[PDB]
Amino acid sequence: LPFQQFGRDIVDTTDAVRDPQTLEILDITPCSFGGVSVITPGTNTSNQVAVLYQGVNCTEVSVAIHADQLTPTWRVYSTGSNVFQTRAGCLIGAEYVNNSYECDIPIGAGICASYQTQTSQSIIAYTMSLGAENSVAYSN
Amino acid sequence: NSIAIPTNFTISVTTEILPVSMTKTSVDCTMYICGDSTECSNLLLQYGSFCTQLKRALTGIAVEQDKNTQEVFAQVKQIYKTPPIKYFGGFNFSQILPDPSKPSKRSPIEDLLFNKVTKFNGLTVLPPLLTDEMIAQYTSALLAGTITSGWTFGAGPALQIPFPMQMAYRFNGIGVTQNVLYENQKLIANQFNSAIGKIQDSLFSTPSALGKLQDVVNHNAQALNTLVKQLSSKFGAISSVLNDILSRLDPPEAEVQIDRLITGRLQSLQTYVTQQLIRAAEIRASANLAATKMSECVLGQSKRVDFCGKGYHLMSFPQSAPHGVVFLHVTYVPAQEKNFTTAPAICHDGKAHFPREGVFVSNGTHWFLTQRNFYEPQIITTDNTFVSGNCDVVIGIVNNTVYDPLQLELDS
Amino acid sequence: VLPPLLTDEMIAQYTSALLAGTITSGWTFGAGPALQIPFPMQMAYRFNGIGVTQNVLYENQKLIANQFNSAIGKIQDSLFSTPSALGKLQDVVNHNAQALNTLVKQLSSKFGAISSVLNDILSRLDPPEAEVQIDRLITGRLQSLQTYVTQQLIRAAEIRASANLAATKMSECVLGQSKRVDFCGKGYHLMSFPQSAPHG
Amino acid sequence: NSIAIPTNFTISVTTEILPVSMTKTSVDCTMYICGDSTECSNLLLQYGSF
Amino acid sequence: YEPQIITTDNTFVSGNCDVVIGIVNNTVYDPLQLELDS
Ligand SMILES: *[C@@H]1O[C@H](CO)[C@@H](O[C@@H]2O[C@H](CO)[C@@H](O[C@@H]3O[C@H](CO)[C@@H](O)[C@H](O)[C@@H]3O)[C@H](O)[C@H]2NC(C)=O)[C@H](O)[C@H]1NC(C)=O
Ligand SMILES: *[C@@H]1O[C@H](CO)[C@@H](O[C@@H]2O[C@H](CO)[C@@H](O[C@@H]3O[C@H](CO)[C@@H](O)[C@H](O)[C@@H]3O)[C@H](O)[C@H]2NC(C)=O)[C@H](O)[C@H]1NC(C)=O
Ligand SMILES: *[C@@H]1O[C@H](CO)[C@@H](O[C@@H]2O[C@H](CO)[C@@H](O[C@@H]3O[C@H](CO)[C@@H](O)[C@H](O)[C@@H]3O)[C@H](O)[C@H]2NC(C)=O)[C@H](O)[C@H]1NC(C)=O
Ligand SMILES: *[C@@H]1O[C@H](CO)[C@@H](O[C@@H]2O[C@H](CO)[C@@H](O[C@@H]3O[C@H](CO)[C@@H](O)[C@H](O)[C@@H]3O)[C@H](O)[C@H]2NC(C)=O)[C@H](O)[C@H]1NC(C)=O
Ligand SMILES: *[C@@H]1O[C@H](CO)[C@@H](O[C@@H]2O[C@H](CO)[C@@H](O)[C@H](O)[C@H]2NC(C)=O)[C@H](O)[C@H]1NC(C)=O
Ligand SMILES: *[C@@H]1O[C@H](CO)[C@@H](O[C@@H]2O[C@H](CO)[C@@H](O)[C@H](O)[C@H]2NC(C)=O)[C@H](O)[C@H]1NC(C)=O
Ligand SMILES: *[C@@H]1O[C@H](CO)[C@@H](O[C@@H]2O[C@H](CO)[C@@H](O)[C@H](O)[C@H]2NC(C)=O)[C@H](O)[C@H]1NC(C)=O
Ligand SMILES: *[C@@H]1O[C@H](CO)[C@@H](O[C@@H]2O[C@H](CO)[C@@H](O)[C@H](O)[C@H]2NC(C)=O)[C@H](O)[C@H]1NC(C)=O
Ligand SMILES: *[C@@H]1O[C@H](CO)[C@@H](O)[C@H](O)[C@H]1NC(C)=O
16 A cells, blocks of 8 residues: 555565655565585595585575675585585585485485495485385286 | 174274374574674674574484384385286275376375475475375385285285285184185175275365374474564564664663573574474374384284274275375274074083184074174084083083084994 | 363263173174173183183183182272372372472562562562563563473373373273283283273 | 193283373463563563463 | 195185185095095
8 A cells, every 4th residue: 555665474574665765666585595514425435525505596506606695605616517406405516316226315305415436436416216116916 | 691793794994194294494593583683693602502402403303204204104125016907806996006197196095185284584494305206105115015915015025915815814814714705705895995985085075184284284384483473572672673773772782682682582492492392202203103003004914902993903005195194994893793692612412512713602493603703603513613521510501412524424 | 270071970981881891792892883792701712812722711710700809809909008009190190289389489489580579579660670670570480481381291291192002001901802911911911991090 | 841831820900000181271371470460461562472 | 835735624615616706626635535435
């Protein structure tokens, strides 16, 4: 309404404002944030680690790396092959393969990581296997 | 001397709904308490490990929820598949087996269950490790296992058995002979199919059927909305927003008001985490019950009364649901009983004859031996009974002729 | 304090119904319709359950009935003589009484305030100071309530687990003949009978 | 080659005691913290949903 | 697996052959009859 100047959500956070000069209504989206998880094979095996940015798109992470915007000051080199989008978040330190295996170090949403020898060892990501297939020879 | 014995039976399928897991959350203690405030963070540092303890408690809960899901559903060593020919002795399992035409590959009942059950300041929600599709695959494997291999599925390799013979075993396991099933196989299959259709309609029609899972979703949504809502409180401060405190007050007064807001916000987080730990314990207990039910009701035939539904347990089928599991328990219910006159033993030539497997009954003129859970009179013979003692010690012994087959042959 | 929804008489009525079904039907009532059976035959099948033939019961029916009646009399004397037998239920009552006594005593605490009584704070201090002392007392009392509720939630979880065990035992040992070792007493299970008790 | 077999038996009756329910309580948060005090209740309102 | 001869001691009889959907034709060996005819 011409009267109202800003808006709030059901939990009383601010989600819209009226520009004081143009009277245009703008939505306010919180700036991207999330947890950071580090997948480590163990320091008695390898010093390579993978980093999961939880709850974000790999596009916003790439943009946040291009501009000096992302708060953590360390960077994981991106090779293209080591950037994989999961439902949990963006994993930028492991290669994704189409070979399923038993879950080792879980990531989430069906995706697990493990340290394996390359087709020379590296961290890989895969969709976890649930079990072997066995069609039962049922008959009358 | 009066005993009631069923002359008919009902195949009943009941629904048991159990929570297995709950929403996994994570909290950025600094962003929540001191969001985008350097001064607040510097005062927050004086509370030590408080954040670490809260983060650790929630991490432990998050891990526990995936453990609970794995324990309930990841009970199969192999992923079993049904045959392409869906003819299980005349029993129709189309409402419980995955429907290949649906991208989610859920059964009609699972699809119904999924359809009925319905970023904040420093708060996140973590996904489960096992996706809905993976849970559906475990449920499908469990159904294929039980349907095609019965009880052999859960205690070694799966061994195929014709479904009517699996049912014959299950009937024998409750004191009903195999011929009852085979003679009434069409009736039993029709009652099963009817019961499944009734369940589908019952769950569709009753909006409260899944309340046990909806309550978990609603309670966690309320906990998160309450925790966020607390950020607007003042706890005695001049304002709930830290930038107003720094703008209006001199540094040491701002520090006093900030400590006041910090205390209120950290108390809100401790309350949230404590409630989550209590709920996590409740969910774990539920998940442990669901895993026990899975092992004893689906991978076997439990003899525990009312554990796997009302009536004598025959079999059960899992179905997945959001944050939980739904079990369809198939039981045998006695019906249409008649009252017969009985006796503990038959007196023949001075010997006391007792049933080997059954109860002696009379229709008012003749004595027969019947199985206790289904009226089916048999001739009382020396093969069906055993002798112990004379016609004196047993109280209420009745005089009747016991037939001996060999003695009739001696006449031949 | 709120009363229970079911009265002691209603609980007694449920216990009586369960007992009448067990005595006159056996487990046929737990599984569906109640089918009458002579009690000695119900026992004969319970003997087959443990793995003893029917003729043992019938030849020793008088001995078995006498031992049963004696054992029940011994239970009545045991409960009468030993006051600690029911301590598990008394302890629940005692802990909740303690929790409420603790909760009310905390109202007298100052928590560092000038006085524990709000009316004294309001009568002795000008509002800008009274609000500080009152807020201190609010924090103390609110923390006391949070502590009470947390302890009640933990106790509630313990009671729920106990109630679930009691329901399982009634379903498996009253409405049936359990084969679980030591689930329902030492020895081979024959039968069980419920009795109502306060809060249990 | 030695087995012991019972020749007699005892029918024994034992007891098991289990809690089922506990005393139900209810607390008026405002009267407990701020009983019959308007100033306290008004301050209590600033703590939110507790 | 421990195959045994199908006999009248190892089985029981209920109903005729026209009810069971999967019933097959196979000789059941009676012990007493074999001695009596011999
Ligand atoms: C044992 O109980 C079952 C279930 O009650 C009995 O089967 C039922 O028998 C009745 C009468 O024959 C059936 O009713 C008929 O159904 C057809 C359906 O098209 C209808 O057109 C007829 O007018 C009549 O209503 C009933 O459907 C049937 N139920 C099932 C599940 O098959 C059975 O006969 C009983 N046996 C004994 C020995 O008591
Ligand atoms: C196993 O059971 C399912 C039902 O649980 C059977 O499928 C059902 O078959 C009937 C008759 O073929 C269908 O009824 C018809 O549906 C169409 C839908 O357009 C309607 O136009 C017709 O007037 C009639 O109502 C029913 O919808 C169908 N339901 C489902 C879910 O498929 C199935 O045939 C059974 N299989 C065996 C082998 O018995
Ligand atoms: C208790 O059960 C017995 C056994 O079923 C009942 O006796 C039997 O009754 C049937 C008729 O309902 C008799 O069948 C008929 O036998 C004559 C013989 O000539 C035959 O011509 C008929 O075509 C028919 O097959 C059967 O023989 C008879 N059995 C015996 C041993 O007498 C008895 O009536 C029942 N009593 C009560 C109170 O229910
Ligand atoms: C198995 O054990 C039971 C006891 O657990 C034996 O029954 C008991 O036998 C004794 C001696 O025969 C009875 O004692 C007598 O009782 C009468 C009561 O009037 C008394 O006048 C006698 O002077 C003597 O004290 C005892 O009461 C009896 N118990 C019961 C419950 O009947 C049974 O004989 C044993 N059987 C075997 C085969 O060992
Ligand atoms: C006062 O506010 C009005 C809008 O509420 C301003 O009007 C617009 O100013 C921009 C300046 O680039 C123009 O492009 C728009 O066309 C103006 N609006 C209209 C309807 O013409 C106005 O300029 C503001 N004045 C001051 C001094 O700030
Ligand atoms: C088991 O037997 C059933 C018949 O009772 C078979 O199903 C029939 O299959 C034929 C084709 O060969 C169809 O024309 C019939 O309509 C089917 N009947 C029913 C009731 O579905 C079934 O295929 C047999 N199973 C196997 C593995 O051979
Ligand atoms: C069962 O049959 C026996 C004999 O076959 C009956 O025994 C008789 O019992 C009475 C009881 O007073 C005696 O007076 C007779 O002398 C007994 N006769 C014989 C031959 O022993 C027995 O009573 C019968 N039981 C029933 C219930 O009828
Ligand atoms: C089992 O044996 C019976 C005979 O004892 C068979 O029944 C006969 O089957 C033939 C088949 O052409 C018919 O012409 C006869 O009329 C039937 N007689 C009777 C009395 O039913 C039966 O088919 C055999 N079953 C199998 C599976 O071989
Ligand atoms: C990531 O962003 C791109 C932007 O085009 C979008 O198409 C894609 O679906 C997004 N992925 C996720 C997982 O949000």
